[PDB]
Amino acid sequence: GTLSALAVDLGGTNLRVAIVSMKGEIVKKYTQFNPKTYEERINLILQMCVEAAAEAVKLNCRILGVGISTGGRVNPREGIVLHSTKLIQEWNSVDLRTPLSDTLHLPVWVDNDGNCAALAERKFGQGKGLENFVTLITGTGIGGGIIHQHELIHGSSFCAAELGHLVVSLNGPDCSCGSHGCIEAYASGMALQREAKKLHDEDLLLVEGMSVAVGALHLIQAAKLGNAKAQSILRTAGTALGLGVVNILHTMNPSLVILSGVLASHYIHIVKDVIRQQALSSVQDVDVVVSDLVDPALLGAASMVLDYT
Amino acid sequence: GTLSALAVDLGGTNLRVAIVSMKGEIVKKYTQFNPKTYEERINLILQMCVEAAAEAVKLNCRILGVGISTGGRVNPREGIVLHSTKLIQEWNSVDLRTPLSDTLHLPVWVDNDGNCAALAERKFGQGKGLENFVTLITGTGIGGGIIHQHELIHGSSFCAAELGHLVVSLNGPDCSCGSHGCIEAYASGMALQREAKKLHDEDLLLVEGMSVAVGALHLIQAAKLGNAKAQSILRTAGTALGLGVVNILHTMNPSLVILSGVLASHYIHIVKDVIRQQALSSVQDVDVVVSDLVDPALLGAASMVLDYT
Numbered sequence: 329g330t331l332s333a334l335a336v337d338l339g340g341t342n343l344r345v346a347i348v349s350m351k352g353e354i355v356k357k358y359t360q361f362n363p364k365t366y367e368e369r370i371n372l373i374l375q376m377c378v379e380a381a382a383e384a385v386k387l388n389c390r391i392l393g394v395g396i397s398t399g400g401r402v403n404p405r406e407g408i409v410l411h412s413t414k415l416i417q418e419w420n421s422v423d424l425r426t427p428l429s430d431t432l433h434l435p436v437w438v439d440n441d442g443n444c445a446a447l448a449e450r451k452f453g454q455g456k457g458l459e460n461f462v463t464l465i466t467g468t469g470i471g472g473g474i475i476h477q478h479e480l481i482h483g484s485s486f487c488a489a490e491l492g493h494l495v496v497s498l499n500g501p502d503c504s505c506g507s508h509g510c511i512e513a514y515a516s517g518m519a520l521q522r523e524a525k526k527l528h529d530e531d532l533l534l535v536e537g538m539s540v541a542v543g544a545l546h547l548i549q550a551a552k553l554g555n556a557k558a559q560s561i562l563r564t565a566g567t568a569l570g571l572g573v574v575n576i577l578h579t580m581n582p583s584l585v586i587l588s589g590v591l592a593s594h595y596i597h598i599v600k601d602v603i604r605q606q607a608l609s610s611v612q613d614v615d616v617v618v619s620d621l622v623d624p625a626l627l628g629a630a631s632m633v634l635d636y637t
Numbered sequence: 638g639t640l641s642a643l644a645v646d647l648g649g650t651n652l653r654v655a656i657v658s659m660k661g662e663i664v665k666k667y668t669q670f671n672p673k674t675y676e677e678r679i680n681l682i683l684q685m686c687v688e689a690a691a692e693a694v695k696l697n698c699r700i701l702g703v704g705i706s707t708g709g710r711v712n713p714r715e716g717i718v719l720h721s722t723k724l725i726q727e728w729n730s731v732d733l734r735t736p737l738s739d740t741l742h743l744p745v746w747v748d749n750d751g752n753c754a755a756l757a758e759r760k761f762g763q764g765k766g767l768e769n770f771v772t773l774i775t776g777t778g779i780g781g782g783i784i785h786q787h788e789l790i791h792g793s794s795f796c797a798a799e800l801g802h803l804v805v806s807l808n809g810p811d812c813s814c815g816s817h818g819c820i821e822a823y824a825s826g827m828a829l830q831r832e833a834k835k836l837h838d839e840d841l842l843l844v845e846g847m848s849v850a851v852g853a854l855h856l857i858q859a860a861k862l863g864n865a866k867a868q869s870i871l872r873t874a875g876t877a878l879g880l881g882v883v884n885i886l887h888t889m890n891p892s893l894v895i896l897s898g899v900l901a902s903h904y905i906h907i908v909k910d911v912i913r914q915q916a917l918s919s920v921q922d923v924d925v926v927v928s929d930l931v932d933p934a935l936l937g938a939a940s941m942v943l944d945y946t
């Protein structure tokens with residue numbers, strides 16, 4: 329069969345399992361909601377992976393291993409999810425390697441989803457060949473990944489690159505991590521949904537000519553079509569993300585910042601604006617781009633298998 | 638003569654030149670104000686260094702080289718100050734190596750003052766032997782230095798570890814760098830002086846039993862003696878610094894954060910508090926300490942000579 333990985337991505341909303349080729353083509357992708365409880369979650373992960381493994385044979389793909397992208401702090405050497413924010417409940421001190429390798433008879437790699445995104449950008453994307461770069465992946469939450477001297481920074485306790493929890497206010501909105509003023513609390517999908525559902529609750533989102541559960545994409549559309557509450561909300565959100573980027577520049581001084589997720593296209597202009605208004609002159613040459621990868625986290629999970637098997 | 642370095646530290650207020658032994662003893666230190674213009678500054682640096690070099694002979698110290706700690710973005714490989722905030726005016730595109738080595742007939746090393754502080758903590762202080770750690774040096778401004786895999790991070794454009802310009806507000810106080818909401822703008826010496834001079838302007842600083850130009854140390858004393866405007870100001874300042882630390886933890890995840898400068902003792906408790914209230918569980922084991930070094934920047938400048946000559 330063709331040389332492939334099984335990739336899993338456990339997100340703040342959806343659980344996705346894919347067969348991914350050596351070249352970074354998604355051969356087939358399965359999607360379910362990410363269950364809210366451990367027992368259900370682990371069982372569905374195994375179920376999905378067994379099915380995908382069986383389909384891979386039918387599609388003439390040879391699976392070399394399983395890579396797992398997950399929210400949370402992860403010890404990749406051991407394949408253990410250490411601690412999760414409430415975006416994934418019941419996801420603490422979880423050994424993923426043992427049940428998956430026992431069931432599938434494959435080697436298993438695990439890392440944080442932002443770290444995986446970085447790995448995808450390094451193998452398939454705009455980070456290829458760069459000694460240094462940072463990625464922020466916007467989704468349900470905001471993930472980060474930091475590449476320095478060509479390699480990930482995991483930190484002294486596997487908590488480096490938790491860039492969604494860069495703080496840019498003394499107060500702000502509460503974050504699901506339990507803090508307040510985190511860029512995730514301003515600019516994530518979950519943040520913008522919550523703010524779109526607010527407006528729509530007080531009949532203040534819909535305008536001009538939208539049809540119509542409110543979400544991020546509706547807030548963006550209201551603003552494009554002149555909704556001033558929605559424009560204000562999005563500016564504040566983008567400013568906060570831009571300031572998180574400023575903190576990254578002044579900390580790591582990467583050559584490149586890659587924004588990914590569907591919201592990346594919507595924030596890149598304001599992020600660039602905030603850098604130009606506020607950051608030091610010596611970081612103004614930083615390249616800030618939108619990712620050209622469909623699904624960094626899933627591709628990154630596959631990349632662990634493809635590079636290390 | 639005993640094995641020594643000449644060390645220079647160009648700060649936001651004072652220019653200091655010292656003879657420093659191999660063991661990190663300051664043999665003799667000269668202090669002048671840092672002139673506000675280039676021509677005066679360069680001439681005084683040379684003057685001071687020639688005098689110190691002459692005294693070193695009399696004190697039976699053998700000078701191996703000159704190390705320079707300066708505010709600003711620095712290319713250490715070339716010995717060039719690239720760009721400075723207005724804390725040091727007329728300090729852009731300055732080749733320091735050439736005039737100092739031509740005049741003194743010594744090799745010359747130059748780095749940012751926060752980077753030097755890190756180097757001192759790695760050689761003489763609590764960073765010795767640590768694969769990773771970060772330092773924040775509070776003075777006129779706030780400096781940073783990042784040690785990762787035992788070595789400094791300088792960044793893609795020599796602007797890494799500009800940690801005084803971590804931003805913790807959407808608005809916020811103006812910073813001298815031209816931004817607003819930087820931790821320097823909240824918590825530096827210059828920030829606290831400015832806030833002490835405010836209060837004292839409206840006869841609202843002095844209390845209880847202080848005698849008496851207002852400065853940081855007077856604001857701290859007013860608060861210790863029950864001044865509630867001053868306590869509020871200091872809490873906000875400490876919170877902002879603590880949040881800058883939170884951003885560092887969630888970015889780099891160092892094992893150790895070293896706070897230095899005279900204000901370090903005053904902020905460490907609140908910094909620890911903010912970490913415990915707001916940072917992720919996986920960074921709670923971070924050690925946060927006050928430096929045991931008298932003068933990290935000056936010792937760090939000496940360390941470049943002592944380690945690399």
Ligand SMILES: CC(=O)N[C@H]1[C@@H](O)[C@H](O)[C@@H](CO)O[C@@H]1O
Nearest residue numbers: 399400412413416469470471492
């Ligand atoms: C479950 C969990 O802790 N998720 C974190 C973080 O680890 C993720 O990278 C991020 C994006 O999914 O969401 C959240 O910020």
Ligand SMILES: CC(=O)N[C@H]1[C@@H](O)[C@H](O)[C@@H](CO)O[C@@H]1O
Nearest residue numbers: 708709721722725778779780801
């Ligand atoms: C002149 C200059 O740009 N100084 C900066 C920074 O580079 C310094 O490290 C810091 C502390 O002195 O002050 C300021 O934040």
Ligand SMILES: [Ca+2]
Nearest residue numbers: 442443472489
């Ligand atoms: Ca991460």
Ligand SMILES: [Ca+2]
Nearest residue numbers: 751752781798
């Ligand atoms: Ca620095």
Ligand SMILES: [Cl-]
Nearest residue numbers: 414415416417
């Ligand atoms: Cl919950």
Ligand SMILES: [Cl-]
Nearest residue numbers: 723724725726
């Ligand atoms: Cl000025």
Ligand SMILES: [Zn+2]
Nearest residue numbers: 493503505510
């Ligand atoms: Zn948070």
Ligand SMILES: [Zn+2]
Nearest residue numbers: 802812814819
């Ligand atoms: Zn600033």
